[PDB]
Amino acid sequence: AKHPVPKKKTSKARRDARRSHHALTPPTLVPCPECKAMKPPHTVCPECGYYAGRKVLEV
Amino acid sequence: MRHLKSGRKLNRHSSHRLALYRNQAKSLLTHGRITTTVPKAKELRGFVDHLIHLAKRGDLHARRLVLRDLQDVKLVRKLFDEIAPRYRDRQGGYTRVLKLAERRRGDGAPLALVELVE
Amino acid sequence: MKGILGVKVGMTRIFRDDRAVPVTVILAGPCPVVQRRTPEKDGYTAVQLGFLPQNPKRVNRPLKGHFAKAGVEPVRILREIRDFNPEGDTVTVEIFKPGERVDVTGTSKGRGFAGVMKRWNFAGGPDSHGAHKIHRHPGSIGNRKTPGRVYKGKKMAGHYGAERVTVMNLEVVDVIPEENLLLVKGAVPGPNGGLVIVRETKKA
Amino acid sequence: MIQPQTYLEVADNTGARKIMCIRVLKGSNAKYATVGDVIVASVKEAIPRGAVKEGDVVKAVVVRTKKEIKRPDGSAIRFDDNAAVIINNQLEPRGTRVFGPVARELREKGFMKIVSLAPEVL
Amino acid sequence: MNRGALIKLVESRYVRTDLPEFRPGDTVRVSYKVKEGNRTRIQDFEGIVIRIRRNGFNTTFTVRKVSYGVGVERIFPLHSPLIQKIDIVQRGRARRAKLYFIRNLSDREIRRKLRADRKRIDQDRAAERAA
RNA sequence: CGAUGUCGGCUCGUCGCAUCCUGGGGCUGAAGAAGGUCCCAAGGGUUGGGCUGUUCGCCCAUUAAAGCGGCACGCGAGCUGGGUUCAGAACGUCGUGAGACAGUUCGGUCUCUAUCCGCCACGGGCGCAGGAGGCUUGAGGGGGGCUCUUCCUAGUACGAGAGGACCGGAAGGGACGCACCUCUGGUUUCCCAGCUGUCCCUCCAGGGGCAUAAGCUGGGUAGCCAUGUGCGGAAGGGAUAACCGCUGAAAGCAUCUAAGCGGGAAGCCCGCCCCAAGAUGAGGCCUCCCACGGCAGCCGGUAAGGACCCGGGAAGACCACCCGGUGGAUGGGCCGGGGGUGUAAGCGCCGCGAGGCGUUGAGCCGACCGGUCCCAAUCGUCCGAGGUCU
RNA sequence: GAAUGCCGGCAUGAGUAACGAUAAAGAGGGUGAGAAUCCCUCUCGCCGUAAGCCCAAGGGUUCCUACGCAAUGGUCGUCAG
RNA sequence: CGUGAGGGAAAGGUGAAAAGAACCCCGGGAGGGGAGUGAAAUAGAGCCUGAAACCGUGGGCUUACAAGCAGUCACGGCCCC
Numbered sequence A: 001a002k003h004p005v006p007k008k009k010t011s012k013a014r015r016d017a018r019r020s021h022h023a024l025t026p027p028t029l030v031p032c033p034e035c036k037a038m039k040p041p042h043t044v045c046p047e048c049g050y051y052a053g054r055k056v057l058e059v
Numbered sequence B: 001m002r003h004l005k006s007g008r009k010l011n012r013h014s015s016h017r018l019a020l021y022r023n024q025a026k027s028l029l030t031h032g033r034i035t036t037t038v039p040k041a042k043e044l045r046g047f048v049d050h051l052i053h054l055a056k057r058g059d060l061h062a063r064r065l066v067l068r069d070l071q072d073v074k075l076v077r078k079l080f081d082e083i084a085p086r087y088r089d090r091q092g093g094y095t096r097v098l099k100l101a102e103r104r105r106g107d108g109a110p111l112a113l114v115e116l117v118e
Numbered sequence C: 001m002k003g004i005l006g007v008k009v010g011m012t013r014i015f016r017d018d019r020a021v022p023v024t025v026i027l028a029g030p031c032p033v034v035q036r037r038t039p040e041k042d043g044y045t046a047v048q049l050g051f052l053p054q055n056p057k058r059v060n061r062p063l064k065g066h067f068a069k070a071g072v073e074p075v076r077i078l079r080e081i082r083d084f085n086p087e088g089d090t091v092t093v094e095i096f097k098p099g100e101r102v103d104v105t106g107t108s109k110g111r112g113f114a115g116v117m118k119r120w121n122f123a124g125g126p127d128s129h130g131a132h133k134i135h136r137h138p139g140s141i142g143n144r145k146t147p148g149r150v151y152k153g154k155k156m157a158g159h160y161g162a163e164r165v166t167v168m169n170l171e172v173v174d175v176i177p178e179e180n181l182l183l184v185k186g187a188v189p190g191p192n193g194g195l196v197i198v199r200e201t202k203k204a
Numbered sequence D: 001m002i003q004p005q006t007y008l009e010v011a012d013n014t015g016a017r018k019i020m021c022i023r024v025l026k027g028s029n030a031k032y033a034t035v036g037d038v039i040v041a042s043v044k045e046a047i048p049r050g051a052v053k054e055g056d057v058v059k060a061v062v063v064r065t066k067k068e069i070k071r072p073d074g075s076a077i078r079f080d081d082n083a084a085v086i087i088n089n090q091l092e093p094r095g096t097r098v099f100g101p102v103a104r105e106l107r108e109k110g111f112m113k114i115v116s117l118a119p120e121v122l
Numbered sequence E: 001m002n003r004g005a006l007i008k009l010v011e012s013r014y015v016r017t018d019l020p021e022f023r024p025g026d027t028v029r030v031s032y033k034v035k036e037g038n039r040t041r042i043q044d045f046e047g048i049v050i051r052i053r054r055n056g057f058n059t060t061f062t063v064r065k066v067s068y069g070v071g072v073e074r075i076f077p078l079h080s081p082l083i084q085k086i087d088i089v090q091r092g093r094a095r096r097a098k099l100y101f102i103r104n105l106s107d108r109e110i111r112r113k114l115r116a117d118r119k120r121i122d123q124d125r126a127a128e129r130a131a
Numbered sequence F: 001c002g003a004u005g006u007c008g009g010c011u012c013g014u015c016g017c018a019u020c021c022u023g024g025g026g027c028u029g030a031a032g033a034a035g036g037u038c039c040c041a042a043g044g045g046u047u048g049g050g051c052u053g054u055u056c057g058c059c060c061a062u063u064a065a066a067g068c069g070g071c072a073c074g075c076g077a078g079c080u081g082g083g084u085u086c087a088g089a090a091c092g093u094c095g096u097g098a099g100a101c102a103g104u105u106c107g108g109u110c111u112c113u114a115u116c117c118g119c120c121a122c123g124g125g126c127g128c129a130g131g132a133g134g135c136u137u138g139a140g141g142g143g144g145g146c147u148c149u150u151c152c153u154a155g156u157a158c159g160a161g162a163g164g165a166c167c168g169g170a171a172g173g174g175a176c177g178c179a180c181c182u183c184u185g186g187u188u189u190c191c192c193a194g195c196u197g198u199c200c201c202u203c204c205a206g207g208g209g210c211a212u213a214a215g216c217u218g219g220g221u222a223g224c225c226a227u228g229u230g231c232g233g234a235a236g237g238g239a240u241a242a243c244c245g246c247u248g249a250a251a252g253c254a255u256c257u258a259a260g261c262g263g264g265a266a267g268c269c270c271g272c273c274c275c276a277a278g279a280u281g282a283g284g285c286c287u288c289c290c291a292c293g294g295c296a297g298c299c300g301g302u303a304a305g306g307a308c309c310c311g312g313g314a315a316g317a318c319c320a321c322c323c324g325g326u327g328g329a330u331g332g333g334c335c336g337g338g339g340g341u342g343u344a345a346g347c348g349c350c351g352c353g354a355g356g357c358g359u360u361g362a363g364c365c366g367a368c369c370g371g372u373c374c375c376a377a378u379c380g381u382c383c384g385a386g387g388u389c390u
Numbered sequence G: 001g002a003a004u005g006c007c008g009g010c011a012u013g014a015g016u017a018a019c020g021a022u023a024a025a026g027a028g029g030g031u032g033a034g035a036a037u038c039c040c041u042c043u044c045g046c047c048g049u050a051a052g053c054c055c056a057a058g059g060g061u062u063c064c065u066a067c068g069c070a071a072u073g074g075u076c077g078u079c080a081g
Numbered sequence H: 001c002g003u004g005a006g007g008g009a010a011a012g013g014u015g016a017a018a019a020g021a022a023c024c025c026c027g028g029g030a031g032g033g034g035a036g037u038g039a040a041a042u043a044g045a046g047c048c049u050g051a052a053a054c055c056g057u058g059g060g061c062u063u064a065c066a067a068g069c070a071g072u073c074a075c076g077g078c079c080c081c
């Protein structure tokens, strides 16, 4: 190869337009039925250790 | 393509992946419950279930087969005398995987507990 | 024109007149008529066939209203056969007899992102004699300053498969109405378990 | 499945022992010859004082191949060597006898004389 | 639906059961139906079966023999209607499923490697004592 | 000249037509068959080798044919580096010499990261005046487009003979394309077995690691595949080219033409296959929800619906797509079947022993075809109409 | 306002290449504000004419212990030349 | 930096006075928020003034059928005085 190189500096506009897909999506969170704490669905609650209505974990 | 191909690779060559499964088995049978990454936890279900099922048959042949993977005679003795009898009436499902809420700090990996069922 | 929706079940071979005949087995009917397309109402003629009954607890209201207006149980797939107006309200394998030729349409198997050698049967490069990291590469894609661009439709790497493909003029080898089974000589696009359409051939 | 450069045993008594295919006489650009197809070949080995000698450009028909032959009855046949019988432009054999079995496909292709000279037709 | 059973169903009309069980290493005579013009005849093909390729109805087996100085192998659909009958000529004991290695063996060495399977030769003699 | 890399090859094409072949023609010093010559025609096709760096060319074996040119003598941020023009060395030759020649001869560093346009694929956004779930029309694009042999007609027409048709009909091929895995043939990184050396568990027996990122070897399912299998080129309709006519003046005859009509190509339009309503010209049909509160606008709660999350998938780089989420067989286990391997271990018996025999087609056993709630898809959250004006 | 000017600052390329041998990891326990990365235990793998041990050059406190983590360490760090 | 001869930098400024921010609060710390000092604290020590490139937060106008050395001339719409 022969070392490709940018021909022009990218403009502020074109740099930030390329970043129009970069914003984060917030985490998916549901309340724990036992302790009402927000937490990801399908995970053992990190605040009380309950899953499927029963204690699984010391926390 | 990967069409209808079974089995994760876990970025390990063949003998390392096998030694991973054997090692996680020993740890799971020793402690009853371990924490790993979700994909490792999922793959370990089938590996250990098979060894528990051979312990349920209980014969000499089964004991020698299980020892190929577990090597620890005291551990196999524990699997035959204490673990396997509590699954006499249970047909499969000797292990469960549950996903943990918090990822690991240094690499973001999602984690899961694997455990023997009651 | 006559047609029916089906499932590709598998391949085998039968023996006919001391010849081994490769066959694809297709589970075709039965297909209820769910809607008819007319020139007055829709500007053309076709029958919308239904196929594979569905758990109603999976069928939302606008679909349910569509079925109920036809007095039809909830079905998994709706597809139209162009220029087909069957007399009955249910299309079955008996629209085809052994000896007829058919066109079969399915979704071909998906290669995903495919190289130039698998997708376009390019020759690739030499594997020795100094060849340098181009063993599977396409080679040149153009000229120089004239025209200074690459043609539309240039054959290049990309997704390949998982697309509609029609194979034409396949001999119907057997029809087994008891099990809604069509036997078609030869190969038929897609995986076992894939949805297919069987139509009367357009080859005279 | 014979192509240019393939060596073939000579299953006749013309004096040739080994021939090397230089053409598959099957249209503009056939890639392979199988049983029943004619080839052009160079004679690479011959016994002293035969009908054909080393260096002769000859025609021959393929009578058995190592690549198995598929038949419409769903069966197949395969031989241990690649063998040919030297012929003249009228498809008749240039020798008087034929050694080893030959594929039955030959009969259907019009090499009736070679088929009947053979000791076995498989 | 059950796609395997539907396939086995389509196949059921062609499955035969008149033929005798055999193993790689057995010597088998296949009476095979053959066309030639303007007649059709039965030709016997006798040799060692070096391979059984199992896929239910699509099972095939391969028989090797030497004919006039030249080795010949035939592949047969195990349920082909062109097979009139198969006769067991000898039971051989092999130590493996595929006997490809015998293609590179002298006649002597083959005889040394595939000796007569006494247990199954006696099994055939025990049966064949019918009422 | 603050650099536009230079022969040939490979790869990948695309275009011109002054056409090599195939299709259509007129003239022939065209009996037939085969040619010659010119006209129309660029749809497709245009082989494999020996020599040489070669382009070219000659030659071998075929072929319907083995066309010629353009694209920076197309294509080195695509590859090669044999040719050729750096430094070494030598021959011929020239020069007193240092050196020189394009003359010859052997050798001689070819740079991981693509910003923009372009190209192949895939999404995200918004739009298509209510919000939705489906099913579609096809404007417009693309793909494809080749050809030979044998037989019948008929050994007929034609010809002294040799030879040998038109038209019409049938079968079989070559190369190419799309799909497929039943068969044939591959692979199959751990599915099974055998083997060596060493270390180890536990001494025997039985096993484990390592010898490659399989230690080696013999096999090998699903999948992915070609060497394997099916299928395609059309048919047909329409309008034409050269060319041939009908009727027919100007021009009492004649003339295919000035009015008018017909025939006529592998080529053109359609027909086949694939994409396609961002076709902003944003199309059509079926069905679903409803005119909700508070100040062509805002705010909030909802509907039909959807998304999130999770189990997954012959779908896939991520994304997307598709299935399923306890009213569940989605994956994992377990069970049956298929399939591979080819008779486990233990025990008994024979042998001094290596081993052999029996139990036993045993044991092991990925993916394939199913069954089964044993394990896991718990529990939930968020978004989403109130339909502008004439 | 230009001298491929000079010095400095700050952009673009871009969240891109890369993170330096394909000998390889897993779990449990501990510590801590924080742990894939520190300590301990068990299992696994790699070297073993070395990838082990001794000596001479050269280097010059890098040695040992306690306390610590801003920077240095291609990540992290409670660890450390 | 260079074996060496030799080459050879960058780097100034709180305030009149340290009065250099006790104490409380979040934090492991860093950092900040109060309190307090000062005429002044965007003079708080990474300190006079504090330009420009460059980066960001908020607001007005504007933009998803469009062809561009990016301006200019015109008219209209919206927002502001």
Ligand SMILES: [Mg+2]
Pocket: A001, C132
């Ligand atoms: Mg390169």
Ligand SMILES: [Mg+2]
Pocket: A001, A002
């Ligand atoms: Mg390059």
Ligand SMILES: [Mg+2]
Pocket: A001, A002, A003, A004, F077
């Ligand atoms: Mg490059």
Ligand SMILES: [Mg+2]
Pocket: A001, C132
């Ligand atoms: Mg390179």
Ligand SMILES: [Mg+2]
Pocket: A001, A002, A003, A004, F113
């Ligand atoms: Mg580069």
Ligand SMILES: [Mg+2]
Pocket: A005, A006, A007, A008
């Ligand atoms: Mg540039």
Ligand SMILES: [Mg+2]
Pocket: A012, A016
């Ligand atoms: Mg900006």
Ligand SMILES: [Mg+2]
Pocket: A014, A015, A016, A017, A018, A019
């Ligand atoms: Mg951009």
Ligand SMILES: [Mg+2]
Pocket: A047, A059
């Ligand atoms: Mg707590």
Ligand SMILES: [Mg+2]
Pocket: B001, B002, C110, C111, C112
């Ligand atoms: Mg794929």
Ligand SMILES: [Mg+2]
Pocket: B001
């Ligand atoms: Mg791969």
Ligand SMILES: [Mg+2]
Pocket: B002, B005, B006, B007, B008
């Ligand atoms: Mg997988």
Ligand SMILES: [Mg+2]
Pocket: B004, B005, B006
């Ligand atoms: Mg799977």
Ligand SMILES: [Mg+2]
Pocket: B007
């Ligand atoms: Mg595995």
Ligand SMILES: [Mg+2]
Pocket: B009, B010, B011, B012, B013
């Ligand atoms: Mg791997």
Ligand SMILES: [Mg+2]
Pocket: B011
């Ligand atoms: Mg990785």
